[PDB]
Symmetry: D2
Subunit: 333 residues, 4 copies
Amino acid sequence: PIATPEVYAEMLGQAKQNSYAFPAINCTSSETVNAAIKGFADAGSDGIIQFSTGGAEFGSGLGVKDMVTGAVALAEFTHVIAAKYPVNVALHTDHCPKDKLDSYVRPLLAISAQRVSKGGNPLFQSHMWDGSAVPIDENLAIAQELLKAAAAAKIILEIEIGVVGGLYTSPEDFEKTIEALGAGEHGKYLLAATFGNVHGVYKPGNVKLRPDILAQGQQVAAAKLGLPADAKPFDFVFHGGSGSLKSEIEEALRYGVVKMNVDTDTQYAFTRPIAGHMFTNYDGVLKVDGEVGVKKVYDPRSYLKKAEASMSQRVVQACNDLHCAGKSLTHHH
Amino acid sequence: PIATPEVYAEMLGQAKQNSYAFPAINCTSSETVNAAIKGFADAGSDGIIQFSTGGAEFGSGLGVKDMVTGAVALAEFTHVIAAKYPVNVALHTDHCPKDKLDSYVRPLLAISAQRVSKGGNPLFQSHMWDGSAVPIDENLAIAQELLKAAAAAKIILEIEIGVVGGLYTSPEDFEKTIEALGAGEHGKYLLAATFGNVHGVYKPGNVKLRPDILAQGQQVAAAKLGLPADAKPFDFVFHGGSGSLKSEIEEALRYGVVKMNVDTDTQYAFTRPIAGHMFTNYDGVLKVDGEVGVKKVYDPRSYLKKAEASMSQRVVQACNDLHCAGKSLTHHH
Amino acid sequence: PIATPEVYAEMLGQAKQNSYAFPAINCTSSETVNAAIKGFADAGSDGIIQFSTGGAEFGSGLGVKDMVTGAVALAEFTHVIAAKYPVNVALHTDHCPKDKLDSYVRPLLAISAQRVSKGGNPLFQSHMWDGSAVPIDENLAIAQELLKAAAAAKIILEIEIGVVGGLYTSPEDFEKTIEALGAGEHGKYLLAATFGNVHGVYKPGNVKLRPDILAQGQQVAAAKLGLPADAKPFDFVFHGGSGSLKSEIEEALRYGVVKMNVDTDTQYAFTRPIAGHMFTNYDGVLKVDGEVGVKKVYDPRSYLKKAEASMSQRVVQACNDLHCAGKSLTHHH
Amino acid sequence: PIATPEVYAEMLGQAKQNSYAFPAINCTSSETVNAAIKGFADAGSDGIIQFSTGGAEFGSGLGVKDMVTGAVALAEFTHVIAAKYPVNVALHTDHCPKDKLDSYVRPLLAISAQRVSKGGNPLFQSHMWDGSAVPIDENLAIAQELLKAAAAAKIILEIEIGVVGGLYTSPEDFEKTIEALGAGEHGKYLLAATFGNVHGVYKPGNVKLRPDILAQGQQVAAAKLGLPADAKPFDFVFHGGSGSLKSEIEEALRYGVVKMNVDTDTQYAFTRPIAGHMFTNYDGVLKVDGEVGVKKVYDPRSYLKKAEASMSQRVVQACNDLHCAGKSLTHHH
Ligand code: NA
Ligand code: NA
Ligand code: NA
Ligand code: NA
Ligand SMILES: [Zn+2]
Ligand SMILES: [Zn+2]
Ligand SMILES: [Zn+2]
Ligand SMILES: [Zn+2]
Ligand SMILES: [Zn+2]
Ligand SMILES: [Zn+2]
Ligand SMILES: [Zn+2]
Ligand SMILES: [Zn+2]
């Protein structure tokens, strides 16, 4: 099913308590949503499907190019599909900067607020406010008001301090975050504290992650809140998960990462069999030498099924890397 | 917008009165729905989006493989998208044989009946009962009861007499159809009377259409109903529209075809630029010689945008071939 | 075997007498020479292999880029190969303009003159002087001296009046040609009289051949020589044979074409299976996703055999189009 | 130039004295010969071009399939080309087993014997007798008689003890070899003593070379001949050079390898740009959607130039790996 707000909060609480995380898979279409959910199910895992501003625009079609329309249309599709799977699927929106709040996150929040006010559940279960490009005090001022609105609509807010490339979060930024927002008692929030994360996939030695930054952030927060030195007040989000080393993922989990974003690696997994299909069927997908091609290989389903299955396999890998495989809160073993 | 039942009936009535038709485009995904609607809009045309049993299964994902789920999920997606376009978009389900009625058309009819009963409109605006594989009397017995159910849910029923290859309808089949169902006064129905139609795309000289069969059917019905010899009591559906000659389409329109199904040709249009993208970007969509590929070309949006635009262009062509271009009932000129 | 000068003159005389012609296939390599000769043999035909200035440069390798070296090296290769086939194979050099005579045709003539002077046969059996870019009187002045040199080395000279595109020869050019060179009694020559010929392959309606120009040339020559009106004093060469219509080839044969040059069409035939091989074996000819490819498909012989066989088939087609198939002067039936 | 017998013996003597080796590149065509020689020249190196039984068959064309014809034709081509380069190029024939001696090595030896007897030099400068599949005494009986014949024709004989995969030579095989053949004073020979060599290219950890076997062989021979313990009486040949580690090549050189065979790696280098050309020019090398392709990209020279240049680069790499780069005996610096 779609995760209810209660189930999603329980998911994140269980992940945090047990030092595992969920994949948050960027999707752009019916096929990619289907691939992501089948991946979670095949892994016996709960999971998160997320739409970026660009993914939502793409989802709305070239004739519309509207983020809200694409996100709503894909979310409505996902609600129907997720009802047919035993695992819990949460819907999220990815990076929304200041100049897009009025045309993405705010209108979507309003849609969920009206669903709530009629006794229903929100359309999305979390939204990202990415204020990393503005000064920390402005970022957290916007965050504080968005958190109030999100919590009232039964929605978790993700925020970002530090910039994701494709830098490293400061100790005072961690302190300000706890001061402005508390530690969940004013509404749950997820913190994308950057620690050398880069969007994309590069050769080894390029990306230089420093997970100790997350460890330091937990200690700074714990001290601020008068908690024991081993407390983990933040629920962290790991951006740019694709291409990461196993050892890097493990250390991040130990310091309270509960959500790792995946996009590039699932993109490659989706496209790879499509590429192979076109080459081995070159004289079927092209009308060559006066021939009329071969419908059974230019039928989009023929290669998109393969794309879907391949992307699902990569999502299974993500669930095993993040140690959420076999841990769905529905307990279908 | 999505066509209301009233708008759809007006669409079909206007097409019939003016000897034009609408394309009915088989879709399987968010991208193909988007491509079809943008095609209608670019042509200033109303149009029909249809889901086959296989398309619906595909739409539901490999983890579900359920026709109702796929059709509902894609229909809900389409409702959100179509609201953002000035033209009217009707939703239809394609060939449903006897052994699939209980798992496709009937449950979908029930969903729409419950929407109606609450003061709303049906989810789909037409459904196809394909009884061509059973004897004519059984076909029309099922048709009569389905027509009553469809009409009560504000839905138009498409039926088929004769088999689509990939044969030719008999005069007594036309007579029985009018006798069993009337001429619209017991609920509007569309008649796929086959006249040599074949699903697929072949070289010229293979497919042998006989449009005079449709002309004969109108005359047989007109005589049965005591109407003038030039009356056209049937609203015909032209299956297997892809690969057809212009001259063949024109003659069919003259005899009362109001809906022409397109699938194969839009499949080729969708896939063609994807094939081209994979070849010209071979070293970006594949990780070759120890390199890591190029994310900006293995991002599914990069080639799927091209696929969408190409399929839209083919849909524009269909609207101009069928003479519905520039005739949308919203009159946005 | 390689055609002796006596056999080559007999070949051309027989073709002329019987209104057929030989293909002259442009070759650039051991593989293409092999493909051309196997084509002649499979057709039971004699034939001509020709090297252009660019083909000879290519044959000499990127480290040399010398026309004489490439032509000699490929000719020596061809002498060994042709000895193993029952049919007669003549060697020719293609278009040599004024500024390349000193670095192509003249040095090659000198090589053959020294072979002759020792009691052997020439290395090449014909050479082309292409003087079409200079005024007719200069063209024929050079032709007259080259003809004397060629004949003394047992070599036939091909000349060109009119330009091949990628225009139409004048009546006075035909008259001057007979006046300057005679009709074979001062040494045999072949005349590339252009009649709308274009190098390359285009869609129909582009290239506009006028074979009546050749008919007029024969009549002009016949009148000059005091011969009957149906005499054919010229042995014509048809440049740009690829892409030509059957009807066009037939008319040209009737007017005395004895040699038709083929290049573009044999190029496509050679490359086509190589293209197919790369696509269907994409993951064998490329090291993909950390794999090491597949030696049995990146072995050049694997696709070059296919290229060779395909080009041979196109050469067989040329022999049947030109009506030299089954007519080799060795009579191996 | 082509290596004279005197120059080739000097080449091998210099390599041995200075612990370097020459690449022996398997070639099959005018293009691959051209690529190999340009590689040697670009490296300022002497080198060896070799034809296998299969390469020679391929060189003779599908219409002939005769090893002697292909080897002679390619050798004659190579004689013309090599005269235009400052470096010395030796011609060799690769593995010839017992049942092919009468149809490859023996007839080629006879051709060279007749050239010698007229005061010329041999066509090939070395021939391989591969008797590894027969018992050692039979192998060396055949070797002894072939060595006498080869030496009399100014040709060096390569022999093989041990089998190349795609095993390890025994101490008594080394002893028998010196006893039967001496150490050069009855004619120079090259010894392919196998030490775990495999033809082909595999992932690391598969091929398990044991160069100490060569070291042991030199010591066994030195003791037999009453030479100092550090003497190297054998000139070794390293089969299956492609895919080898640098460290492995270095150790083999120290123990007296003077010739390393390369085939698989130059095959990949040749094919790789052809593959790339076909993909990026897919709509030029194929006639697609009613178009006629693009002659400038289906011209075989367009991709074969790229193939030639790429293979030359790999040959340069081989000269630097084997430490013969910059050491050509013509001293063109
Ligand atoms: Na990344
Ligand atoms: Na069709
Ligand atoms: Na042409
Ligand atoms: Na190897
Ligand atoms: Zn991110
Ligand atoms: Zn459990
Ligand atoms: Zn149909
Ligand atoms: Zn209007
Ligand atoms: Zn020409
Ligand atoms: Zn005969
Ligand atoms: Zn070997
Ligand atoms: Zn030097």
